[model samples]
Target chain A: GAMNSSNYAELFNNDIKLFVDDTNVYRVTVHKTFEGNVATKAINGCIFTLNPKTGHLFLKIIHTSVWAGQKRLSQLAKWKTAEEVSALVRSLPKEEQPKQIIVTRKAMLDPLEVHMLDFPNIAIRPTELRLPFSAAMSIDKLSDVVMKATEPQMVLFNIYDDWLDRISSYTAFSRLTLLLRALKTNEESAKMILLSDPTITIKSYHLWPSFTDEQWITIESQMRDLILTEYGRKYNV
Target chain B: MNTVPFTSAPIEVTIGIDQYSFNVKENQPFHGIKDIPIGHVHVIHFQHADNSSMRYGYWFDCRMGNFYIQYDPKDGLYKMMEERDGAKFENIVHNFKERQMMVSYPKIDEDDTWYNLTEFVQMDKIRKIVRKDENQFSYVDSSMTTVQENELSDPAHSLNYTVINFKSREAIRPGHEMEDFLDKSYYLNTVMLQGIFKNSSNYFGELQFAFLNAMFFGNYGSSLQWHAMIELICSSATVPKHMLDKLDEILYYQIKTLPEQYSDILLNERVWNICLYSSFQKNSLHNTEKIMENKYPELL
Candidate 1:
C-alpha cells in the first residue's frame, strides 16, 4: 500500500537518533507514532554499512519510510554530528573501513555572490561529494556524509567578513567583470544556456526605481557604516 | 581623358518588367585640363517616343564623382547618386508619388549606358533628418519625410547620403555644399555633456530619463539615446577622467541602494545590458546578481 499524508506525518514527525552498531556500522532509530492512536513506538530508521573492499558507504532503510529516512539524513547533516561518527567509524581496521567519508552541499553564498563580495580568490572548495548509489541510499547515511562534509568547511563566516570589508572599501565593477568573464565561454553554448536558464526573465524598463542624489548618499553611508561595524567585529584591532 | 559629346542611335533597355526606349540626345561634357578629370561633367537626356514632356535626365559630374537623375519630370522627383567605383555609379531615387525609394546601378557597355532598377524600399522605412531649428538638424525621426511637400524628401538612403533641407529657419545652403552635419559623435558628446550637467549626481535618474524618452519617442531617437547612454558610461573620449571617476563613485552608491526589483528591469534594458555586460564598468554583473538574488531566493 502507498503511504498517505497521515502515514508520512506519523513516520516523520517523531524524534530520530543516530548511533553506532557493534559491527561499527552507523544506524538510525526513530520514535514511530501509531496511526490514529496515542501510543508511540521506537523503530530502526536505517542502517549504514560499508563495502568490504571498496569502502563505499551503503545505506538500507529499515522502516521503509522514504520520507522519514530522507528527513533523518538531512537532519544529520544540518545538526553537524556526522564528523564524530565518521571518526569513530574510522577507528576500525584499516582494511575493513574507509579513511574518511565526505558529504557535500551548497554553500550559504553562491559562486556569483562570493565573487561580487570580492571573495573570488578565497579558496573554498565546491561541494560535489556524493554517497555511492546515492539515489538508492537511505537518508540516515546521506545525512551522516553531509554532516561530515560541511563541519570542517564552515567558511561562510570568513566569506561574510570579507564581503563586508570589500563593501566598506567601496570597490566597484565586480558584476561587470563577472559577466565579461562568463562571456568568455563558447558563444553558442552560452546562448543556449541563456535561452534555457529559468532564472533569466524579461522585465519592463520603467520598473526601475528612481532615487535622488541625497538619498543615494544616505544609503551608501548607511551601508558603509553597517559593513564597518561588522568588519570591526570580525577583525578586531 | 578627352571630353566629347558622343551620341548614339536609340536603344531599348528592360527595368524589371517595364521596358523603356531612350533616344539619346547631345551629351554636354564639362572638361578640365588637370591630370585627373577635375571639372568633367556630362548630361544625358532620354526622350520616350516623340513626347517632349516625358524626358529623363542623368547628370554626371566628374569633379564631385557623383551622378544625378531626373526620372520623373511631372513631379520633378530626382534620384540622388552614390559612386561605387571610379567607373560604376548607383542612384537612390525617392519616388514621392509612389512613396518608395528606388535603388538602381548603371550598366555601362560598349554602345549604351543602361540604368537597372535594383531594389525598392518604402519611404517610411528610411531614416529622416528633420530640421528642428536653424542650425539644429534632428536625425531622430525614422518615419515619413517633411523636407518638402513634393520637391524633396530628406530620407537618408545610405550612411553616407546627406539629406538636403531647402526650407530652413536659416539661409538656404546648397544641399551638395552642406557638410556632413549629422555628426553622431559630436551629437553624442553634446548630449552627454547636457545629461551630466543637468543631472550630475542622479546618474540612475538620468538613465531612467533616457529610457523613458526613448520609449516615448519610438525607435530613431530612442536608439540614439540608448547609444548616447552607453557611450557616456563606457567611452573615455568625451567624458573627462575626473568626471568619469566621480560618476563611477556615484554609480557605485546608486547601484548599492538600487532596489532588488530593478535587477531584471535593468538586465532587460539595452542600455543597462551593455553597461553590465561591458568590462568598462567594474562589478556591474556582480551587483546586479546581488539584487536579483535578493528578489529571487536561491537564484544564484
Candidate 2:
C-alpha cells in the first residue's frame, strides 16, 4: 500500500522495452508501474538511476505525469522531442555525459525523436528483439505453434546482412529463432523451408533501406557458430 | 552445454511422508533434458514450528546431494547452500536423511542470487533498508534474513543475476591450480589469435592482442569475450568484417560458459569452439609459427 521506488529495479529487469546506444540508452516505460506508492511530478516521473561505478544513468521516465487535480493530463507526450531528452542529458553533471544513459520507455519514439536520440559512435542494440516483452513467457507457448508450422523440411531462413546490428533485425532474428526452435525434431521429413517470407523482407528493407546482401553469409555462419559453441552442443540445435 | 556422455543409476529421496524418485543419466545437464542443457534454481523447503531448512535442487550425484547442511547455533536455523556441484533432488534428500534433515518449501528470496539468506545480515539490528511487511518467508528467522554464509561461490551466479563481471578474471578463485590453468589458456588463446590474424596486414597484431585481452584478462567466459572481440574486429579495417559478423552470431548464442569444467584447455575449447570453423582452429595453424612467434605486439 506504499509507492516505493525500491522495487523499480524489477521494471528494468522484467518489463520496459529498451534500445541501447553506446552513450545514450533509449527505452519506453512499461504500460504500468508495479504495486508501489511512489509518484513523481514529471508527466512521467523520469527518475535517473545512476550506476555508481561507471556513472551510467538508466534514465527511468514515465510516459505521462499526473495533473494537479489528480486528473491525468492530455496524451502524455512529455519528452516530445529528442532535444527535450538531450536537454535533460545535457543538464546532468559531467559524470553523466560520456556516460551510458539508459531510458526505460513504453511508447515508441517518432523518426525525429529517433534521430535526436542518436549519439556519435555509439552502438545501438535492440536487445529486446532477442527477448521481447513476453519472450520469456511466450517461448513455451509458441513451442507447439512453431513445431506444427515446420511440416516436413528444414526451413533455411536467409538473414539479410544489411540489417545486421539493427534493432529491427534483432526482432527478426528473435522471431526466426523462436519459429526454428518450434519445428518438429523427430519422425518424417522436416520442413525444408528456406525462403524468407516476402512480407518480412519487404518490411525489413522498408525499415532499414541500407540492407545489403554482402554480409548474408555472416548470418548462417553465426548460427553455425552458435550451434558449434553454445546452442548446438547443448540443445543439439 | 556439452553432453560428455555421463551416466548414473536411478535414485530416490524420502522427505517426511513423500518419497520422490527420479532417474539420472550420464552427462545430463542438471535438468536431465539434453535439449535444455542449462542449470536452474529449484527452491526446496522443509518446515517446522519456528524453523525451516532448504537446499537448492542441484545436479549432485545419485547417492547423496553433496551440499553442506549447517545449523548455526546462535541464530538457530538449519541451512544448506545451493552448490554448483550438480546437486540433484535425490542427492539433497539423501544428504538430509544422512544428516537428519527435512524438506518442504523453504522461504527463498529468489532475488538473492546465491540463495544464502544469511548473507550481509545483522542478527538483531535495523538495516539501512527494510523488508516488506508480508513477504512470506520460511527456513530461517527474519533477523538473519540477509546474512550470507555458506553461499554458492559460483561466478556464474553473479552473471546469472546480470552482474556481468566479464571485465576482469579476478572472480575465479585464486590458487596454484587456477593460476596454472589461466597461464595455459592465455598461452593457447594467444596462439590461436595470432593464427586468425595471420592473413591481415597492419592490424593483425592489434587484433590478436585485443582478442587475447578479451578472453584471458577478464572474468568473461565465452559470450562476454565474444562481445569485446567482436567490437574490436568489427571496427578494424584489416580484418574481414564478415568474419567478425559471423563470430558475432556464434558468440551471441554462446551466452553461457561451461559451468562444470575448470581446466584452461577445456575452457578455451568451450570459448573458442568457433575457431574450429575458421582457419584458426588449434590443429590448422602452423604449429611452428604459433609456438615460435605468438607475436604479442605490445607484451612480447
Candidate 3:
C-alpha cells in the first residue's frame, strides 16, 4: 500500500508528548554533520539528549539523488524530521542558519518529535515526575541552565515566573518542573506524581525561594520608604 | 540527506468545533477563572505604534479579534503612544459591552513597572480590518476546513486584511466594517486626528493625523472619526486605571447608550438586564440573560 498520511496524524496524538509531560525522554542531535544531512554535531545536544537520555538520533535517511533512494529515504524519514525538510524547501534565497539546525531536521519522517524512539524502556505515565531541573536565571535577567546533573533524568524539568511574551517550550518545561516540585511524595495528593519511591513528608515540596504575588506586594509596599529594607527568605517545613 | 518534503492531509487532527463568527471566539489576558460578565467592562489594551525593528507586530496585530481606542483625561490624550528606536503602546480597556473598545498591544515585557501606557477604562473604537476583496472571517465551512478568500493574507490569515470602520454610536452591519471606511461613507481621517485624539502633547498627533491621512487624503480616503473617538479613548491614558472604576464606567456608558428596553451592546444584551445589577436583578430577565451578563462582566 501507499504511504498513509492519516496514520501519521493518529501517531502524533497518541504518542508525541508536549513538553508539559515529566516522564517523556526527548531526543536531540548535536554532534557532527556530513554534507547537508543532520548528524550529531553540537555539544549541548550530545550532552543532554543523546548521552544522558540515549533516546534520540539525528540520522537522516530520507532524501537521495535518485527516485528509489528518495522514496526509501522519505519512507524512513517520514517520522524523524520531515517537517524540517519542508521548512527548508519553503525558505528560498536564504541560507538556513546553524542555530536553526534543530528546527530544520529532516531526511526522515520526524520520528524524534512524534514517536518515542529514544527510550523504549521508559514508559511516560503523564502523572509522574522522574526528576527536577533548577532554573538557570533570575526574574530580573534571562539566564541559561549551566549546570546539568551527571545522571540527568530521561526528562529534566524547570518552572518559573508569570513573565510572558516569549517561547512556550521553556515556559512549559518550567511549569512542569515547578509542578513536580509541588507534588506530594505520597500518591494521595499526587497529580503529577513520580514513579520513584522513598518518600518524605512536609519538607519534600520546595517552594522555589518565591511566594505568591499578594505576598510579594505586601512585602514591597510595607517598606516602601524604609531606611533599611532588605529581602529575606521565609519558609515552613 | 532526504531531498523532498512530505505533504498529506491530516489524519487525526484535533478539531475544535466552535459556532462562532469568522471561526473566531473572544480571547482575553485572563487565564484563571472567568471574571468578565455580559455588559461588564473588560479593560482591554493595545499598542499601535509599529516599530521597524520588530518582525512580529504583523502577527501581534492579527491575533486581536476585538479591540477599541478611547478618550482619556490625564494625558489629555486617548492613548499614549511613545517612540524609542520605534513606536509601541500600552493600552488598557473596559471589557463591558459598551460603545467602548480597546486595542491589544503586544507586551512591553512582563514586569509590573514596565507599562508606559496603561488605562483601566475603555474606548469607543471597535474597529476591524476588513476582509479586503477576500474573506478573512472565521465561520465554520460545510467541509469544516477554514477557507479564507484572500490567499496571500498573513499565513495566519492576517495579511490582505484591511481595517474596517467599527461603530459605537452607529449601527452594526455585515460589511460596514469593510466598506464603511473604504467608501468614505462617513467621516474622513482628518476629523479623527484633529478632533478625536485632541492631544496637547502632540506626541501622537502626527500619528493620529497620519492614520486619518491614510484613510482620507489619498487613493481612498475615509472618515474614521467615529472609530478614532473610540480608539483614542481606549489607547489614550486618560481613562481610569482602577479596575472597579473601569468596571462601573463601562456599565454606566453601555446602559446610557441603550437603544431601548431590549438591545445588544457590542454583541451583549441590554445593559439593565446585564450582571452589573445582579443585586437589583434578584428577579426578572431570563437566567440566560443573567448568564450572558456574567460572561463578559469585565467588558462593562
Best-performing candidate as measured by lDDT: 1
Please give, for residues A1-237, the per-residue lDDT of candidate 2 as tens digits.
111244323223322222322111122233434776554443222222332222122433333322335332222232232333444445556443433323333232321134333343322122232222212112222222233432211111223233434444434444344333322221011122222333323343121223244333444444344334444555766
Ranking by lDDT: 1, 2, 3
Candidate 3 lDDT by residue in tens digits, A95-208 = 321111122122211232233222233222221223332211221111122213232212222223322223343343434334333331211223212211233221222213
TM-score of 3: 0.19
Alpha-carbon runs more than 4 Å astray in model 1: A1-237, B1-131, B134-210, B235-274, B284-300
Residue B166's C-alpha lDDT in candidate 2? 17
Per-residue alpha-carbon lDDT of candidate 3 for residues B1-300, written as tens digits (9 for 90 to 100): 000000111121111111000111122212111122222112221121322121111101112232222224353222212222211211122222122222222233453210111122111221222222222221111111111233212334221122323332131222232232222223323333344434322313222222222221120121222123323333222332342243333333333322332232223232233333332222322343344455544444
Off by over 4 Å in 2: A1-237, B1-41, B46-65, B81-160, B163-300
Provide per-model DockQ scores. 0.01, 0.01, 0.00
What is candidate 3's DockQ? 0.00
Report lDDT per candidate: 0.30, 0.29, 0.25
lDDT of 2 by residue, B29-70 (tens): 222211111232222222333322222221211122233333
